[PDB]
Design an enzyme around this catalytic site. Structure first.
Site, PDB file in Angstrom:
ATOM      1  N   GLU A 203      42.082   3.023 -74.295  1.00 32.56           N
ATOM      2  CA  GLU A 203      42.215   4.064 -75.310  1.00 32.56           C
ATOM      3  C   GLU A 203      41.918   5.468 -74.709  1.00 32.56           C
ATOM      4  O   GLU A 203      42.686   6.402 -74.926  1.00 32.56           O
ATOM      5  CB  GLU A 203      41.282   3.737 -76.473  1.00 32.56           C
ATOM      6  CG  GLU A 203      41.463   4.647 -77.671  1.00 32.56           C
ATOM      7  CD  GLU A 203      40.598   4.270 -78.840  1.00 32.56           C
ATOM      8  OE1 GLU A 203      40.694   4.966 -79.871  1.00 32.56           O
ATOM      9  OE2 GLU A 203      39.852   3.267 -78.750  1.00 32.56           O
TER      10      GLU A 203
HETATM   11 MG    MG Z   1      41.856   6.773 -83.165  1.00 34.29          MG
END
Ligand code: MG
Ligand code: MG
Lengths: 596, 596, 102
Positions: A203
């Protein structure tokens, strides 16, 4: 006669050359790419457009610089709610407070499919509406013929989900994406590589790829890179790092500079070796670490629980909150807050809306991650959550009726530091951060640091700086000065809440002006304190960033931003940049892989 | 309770496993493939079906064993007629007998496009009709989604075409294929690799690939091949050679066996080196040679011209033809012949229908191939065609009114040998055969020969054997015995033409029976003589074929033939077998390469 | 003539080693391997992919590959594997697991 017919001959010769040209040249075509953000607060579609090019004997590829966001869709239900609703029905209500035989839940897989279907139909309708409204008829023909790759990725919301539930849900989500409504003619398709949960480190890496791509720091051409006398490709400009604070987690990402000394316990990522970027791109060793409970919603719940369980703050049912304004009062709970027109703050009683639900759900003795691991139990107990108690008492702030704001910025910083940034034990559900060598935020800059410039991102992080800039408390050219920020926030956060005819107001201490009190800024001072704490930790590092920038967006070549900051562009790039693999999966197999 | 729910749990676990299976397995899909045969007599479509397979991270490929012909379409105009019609209009009538400035023809390229369009629309309509009639609704969805590769290849009809005309026509043909009618939804597409003229050697090589593929002699798996201790892959069974006699040319193709002694002047083809077959396939060195004027139509015209210009055969306006039956009479011309219900033979007067038109058109002093090359002029003059004379006298059989059949097989063989098989000079338009080291058919077996089995193909070649088998003149198990064939044909060819009430009849000499006289069998004895001559030449070779077979078709796995003999399957295989290149051109670029 | 690839891998002994010491040692070990005595004529050579510390998980995975290779359970040929009707290759015999106590 001869001069005029020679021209007529030249028209016939041109007609042939124009056609030879067509069958020799590369041809450009428009493709739509869809990224479904399955975040903590919601599941939302992100519709992108990209230019594909097909060349004779070279196949088809995407021009990465052509990637543009057309629209970020509506905020539909998060995957956590889908799963917990399914549990409520099939494991029974209050499964958070009782032992559940997970083996028995296998008989309810079709029912999980039906629940997932409801959400998928809303997302498909939203995606199709965006496509229908933005494209013209010639663009729709191209978009419909090429196929539409879908990348649904889940983040912090279901990262800590118990048992096998989430991974079974992903198998169902992919099947649903691969069977779109035939009516609209848009050929959506996915596979287990595009649609999957993504780690906090991934991420963070994807948001780092997005930032450097959009800002033109990352590239493989002579404009963005240079090949040395030893055949090594270097980026022309320094690759920048990123701090991203979302709803549930916060990501800290930075490239490591030349001759960087890493302890064996700290695990940095090599972009090429870990297959994030192809070989033709400049190499980089990147620290990427994600912290659960550091997001806006999750830290708000945890901070209240911890602060109001502290005797220094809890007295006679009144929890004195230094991160909240003087004159601000609320019910003592981590439930969602609404600043009403009358100046009163209404705390939502719904368990699903309580900012402590995800943490209190994780912190249960009926979760194998707690029952088998004392380590995790101790982390929960360190944040006043007894995993042995029912959900209602785990979420409850005991002997506390009212939260009152004291508007004391230094006390706020002090508490954000002890609770969130530098806790005694790692904040729960952080085995990933711990495995990469970092127990907490304070350890990130102690163990690793870089001269790489840094970008601070997130809705709250930007509102913190922009608010102080608007009231002329901070200069427009603010470059990260800690004392300047602390001095500005100390002044702003000592503001009084005045209830006026046009609604509640935040009144600045020395006739500096005012602003409206709302549900988005009532607790902004916690975020300013988080910023201050983070800046002090970066300032203490062996190597400090060359510069620190707060950015809402990055401008494209036409002065207008082409896409948003975040992991979405990065995930696209991570797949499209591997030319051969992308050609095989997106074009050779394609949507036709799904044909009956 | 526990036994029944354990089964219910197993249904949920199965539901997941079935979906995991779907997203891990290869998926099969149907594709249509189109081969347009742009031959000498006509342009006809050939619609094929094949099974494609897509595997995760492996792309898409065609199972070569799944290739099946669904239908060979209608016989539309040949490309020669399209071009000569265009010349008639833009260079003027009788351009065959006058000097033409080819440079001036460039101003008429759009007009050539309009002429080509008319033919392309008929072929598209025919292809679409075949597809609509053979496919069901689920098959049409697959066929429409995948794209339909088109391979239009020209052979002997325009192989000898003068100037730049033919290659300019190909540029226009490809543009037309790449712009199909949007109404039908079939996404036809081509490129310069699929749609092009093919040499006689390629034509022969492709027919050799077809034969060995269908008969299961050619393969890359353990069933059809074996890898030795030194890593060399050998075919399990001997690869067979092919003799193919078409309308305009005849191809002779054979693989070369171990320790084969070739003179430096003879150029054999290596299948892998010349990129006809991929590396994973067994290697072979193949002799492939094509002879213009050896086809059914072209040799019929040339044979009449040569035989009836010979004083041994031409006397008092009567040309005595030993290749024609006793009692058979026709007008002395190479014009197309029609056996009428009354027993009379009507010779078509239309110049376009005269079997000498292609040769007389080639053999012109206004063709740079004749005017600049004495070599070519001498080849023309050797076949009684004076290139200095107008087209009408070049095609005319001088001082000859009537052709009468003498039914003398040995005289027929003798003439076929001197005129067609072993002429003094190479037959015109044969620079390709000559360049590979072979001036004529007689030289093929003198310079190179093989023990490789041989297959004899062509409509006339088969009718020659089948006719003799039907009248019990040849045994059903005929294996190529020269004397047996000559003895049988000598008897059959000494038959008398009797005109009966039910139409004309071929009466066998010793009450052996009879058959109807028609436009297809009136001159079959020339083909029997060609067969005899060819068999004698093969029998004289240093190495003789292991066996000789006459085949109309090759049976598939279900007892029914999957496709026809010829170059069509071979051309498909030549492209589809190169997996990576095919994936890029057919699937990555695909029909979308044409998107506006 | 062919060259001799060298794979020096460290396991549990220095797996828990503190600071940067071990990784600096590996850089030196590779340089030493890449400079063999010219006298013997054996061309030893390495690179950062062959010579490095291996994790406990890799160590276990490699011992699993060894076991199945030697026992003929692991293979890609028709003798040790089978391709199904859906094009998926399965091992003909069950792949075995391993407990290794060093
Ligand atoms: Mg997010
Ligand atoms: Mg033909």
């Amino acid at each position: 006669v001869d001069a005029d017919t020679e021209k007529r001959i030249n028209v016939g010769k041109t007609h042939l050359q124009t056609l030879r040209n067509l069958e020799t040249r590369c041809h450009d075509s428009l493709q739509a790419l869809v990224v479904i953000d399955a975040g903590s607060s919601s599941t939302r579609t992100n519709v992108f457009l990209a230019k594909t090019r097909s060349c004779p004997n070279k196949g088809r590829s995407i021009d990465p610089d052509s990637i543009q966001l057309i629209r970020e869709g509506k905020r539909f239900t998060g995957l956590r709610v889908v799963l917990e609703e399914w549990l409520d029905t099939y494991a029974g209500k209050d499964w958070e407070s009782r032992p559940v035989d997970a083996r028995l839940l296998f008989q309810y897989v079709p029912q999980m499919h039906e629940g997932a279907k409801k959400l998928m139909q809303l997302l498909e309708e939203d995606t199709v509406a965006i496509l229908d409204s933005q494209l013209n008829e010639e663009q729709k023909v191209q978009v419909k013929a090429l196929g539409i790759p879908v990348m649904l990725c889940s983040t912090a919301g279901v990262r800590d989900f118990h048992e096998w539930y989430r991974d079974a849900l992903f198998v169902l989500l992919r099947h649903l994406i691969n069977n779109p409504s035939p009516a609209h003619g848009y050929k959506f398709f996915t596979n287990p590589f595009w649609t999957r949960p993504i780690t906090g480190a991934e991420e963070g890496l994807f948001a780092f790829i997005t930032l450097n791509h959009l800002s033109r720091r990352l590239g493989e051409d002579p404009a963005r890179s240079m090949i040395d006398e030893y055949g090594v490709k270097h980026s022309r400009n320094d690759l920048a790092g990123v701090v991203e604070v979302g709803g549930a987690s916060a990501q800290i990402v930075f490239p490591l500079q030349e001759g960087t000394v890493l302890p064996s316990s700290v695990r940095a990522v090599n972009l090429q070796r870990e297959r994030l970027l192809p070989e033709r791109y400049p190499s980089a060793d990147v620290v990427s670490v994600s912290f659960m409970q550091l997001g806006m919603a999750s830290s708000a719940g945890l901070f209240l629980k911890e602060l109001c369980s502290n005797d220094e703050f809890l007295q006679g049912g009144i929890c004195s909150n230094p991160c909240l304004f003087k004159g601000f009062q609320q019910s003592c709970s981590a439930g969602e807050v609404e600043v009403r027109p009358d100046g009163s703050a209404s705390v939502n009683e719904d368990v699903r809306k309580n900012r402590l639900k995800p943490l209190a759900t994780y912190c249960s003795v009926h979760n194998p991650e707690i029952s088998f691991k004392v380590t995790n139990e101790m982390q929960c107990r360190e944040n006043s959550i007894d995993p042995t108690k029912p959900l209602a008492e785990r979420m409850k702030i005991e002997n506390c009726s009212i939260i009152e704001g004291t508007g004391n910025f230094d006390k706020c910083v002090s508490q954000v530091e002890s609770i969130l940034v530098a806790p005694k034990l790692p904040l729960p559900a952080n085995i990933e951060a711990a495995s990469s060598g970092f127990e907490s935020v304070d350890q990130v800059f102690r163990f690793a640091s870089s001269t790489a410039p840094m970008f601070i991102t997130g809705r709250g992080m930007l509102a913190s700086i922009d608010t102080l800039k608007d009231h002329r408390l901070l200069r427009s050219d603010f470059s990260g000065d800690v004392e300047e920020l602390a001095e500005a926030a100390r002044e702003f956060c000592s503001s009084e809440v005045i209830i006026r005819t046009d609604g509640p107001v935040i009144q600045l201490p020395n006739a500096r002006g005012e602003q409206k009190l709302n549900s988005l800024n009532f607790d902004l001072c916690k975020t300013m304190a988080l910023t201050v704490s983070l800046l002090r930790h970066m300032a203490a590092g062996e190597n400090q960033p060359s510069f620190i920038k707060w950015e809402k967006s990055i401008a494209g070549p036409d002065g207008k931003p082409l896409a948003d900051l975040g992991w979405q562009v990065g995930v696209i790039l991570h797949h499209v940049l591997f030319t051969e693999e992308w050609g095989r999966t997106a074009y050779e197999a394609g949507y036709s892989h799904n044909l009956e």
